[PDB]
Amino acid sequence: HARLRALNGLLYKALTDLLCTPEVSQELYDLNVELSKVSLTACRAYWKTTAEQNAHMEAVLQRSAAHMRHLLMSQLRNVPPIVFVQDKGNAALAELDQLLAVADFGPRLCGIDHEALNKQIMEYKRRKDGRKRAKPRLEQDSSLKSYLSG
């Protein structure tokens, strides 16, 4: 568990170093993508999202994922495939807003059940009209008496 945590941290550091250096790719270096999270199970990568530029960043990352995995294999050589997850805050909100723009709208007390208790009282009206606990360690045993008896 802690070993997997350290492995996740190492993967995060390696991916950040690959992102920062220009030797990996001029496109990736120009993007200046920053990673929010890296977690290994396959590997899930989560990068902070800035729409058009976000789509371009996602497309470039998807294109360069294979090269990134190949470069990671040079280092940690047995690296599982890396999955990039775009963190649009709550992605559900972004997708929902996109669909909503796309979509069509057409033309424009007391804390008790007082009633139940009242019913029960009316029903009633109608029908009318400690000790010592011995310690476990002090309990006697007569097995030895029986053994000595015969």
Binding site: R3, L10, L31, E34, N78
Partner: protein, 85 residues
């Protein structure tokens, strides 16, 4: 008193303001200025500061040692050369 527009200054490249801001934020984070401001928002009592610094040093040492151990041991993470034995 110092000359201005030198410290913590990043030139925007081809109007890419977001990338320049990200670079500036990363520079400040690398220099620890952001964490410095966050810690300086409220007073951290000296005993608390010493405890936090000692814990951070121990955590960094442990993380480095664990990373070294994992890198050393992962050299054996290859296909089994003597399968069936």
């Amino acid at each position: 008193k110092h000359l201005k527009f030198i410290a913590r200054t990043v030139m925007v490249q081809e109007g890419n303001v977001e990338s320049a801001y990200r670079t500036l934020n990363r520079i400040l984070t690398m220099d620890g200025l952001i964490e410095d401001i966050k810690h300086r928002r409220y007073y951290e009592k000296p005993c608390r500061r010493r405890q936090r610094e000692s814990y951070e040093r121990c955590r960094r040492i442990y993380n480095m040692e664990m990373a070294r151990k994992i890198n050393f041991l992962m050299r054996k993470n290859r296909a089994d050369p003597w399968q069936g034995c």
